[PDB]
């Protein structure tokens, strides 16, 4: 019962990649570059 070593290794690699991707999903402070223009 429990994880096999291959399962543990694959899970650890997949979660490391997932955490890297999720961290990459964040935004920089200047990330939404908005172009400005006006016409009681």
Partner 1 sequence: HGKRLFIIKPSGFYDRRFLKLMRFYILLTGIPVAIGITLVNVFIGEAELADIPEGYVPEHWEYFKHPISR
**Footprint of partner 1 (CB under 8 A):** 25-27, 29, 31
Give dist(CA 12, CA 16) in Å, integer: 6
The residue with tokens 């400005």 is 36
Q: Which of 22, 3, 21 is nearest to 11 (CA)?
A: 3
Please state the closest distance from residue 12 (CB atom) to partner 1, in A: 25
User: Which residue, 2 or 35, is less far from partner 1 as judged by CB?
Assistant: 35
User: Which residue, 2 or 22, is less far from partner 1 as judged by CB?
Assistant: 22
User: Which residue, 1 or 28, is less far from partner 1 as judged by CB?
Assistant: 28
């Amino acid at each position: 019962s429990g994880y096999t070593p291959d399962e543990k290794l694959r899970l650890q690699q997949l979660r490391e990649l997932r955490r890297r991707w999720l961290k990459d999903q964040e935004l920089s402070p200047r990330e939404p570059v908005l172009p400005p223009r006006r016409v009681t």
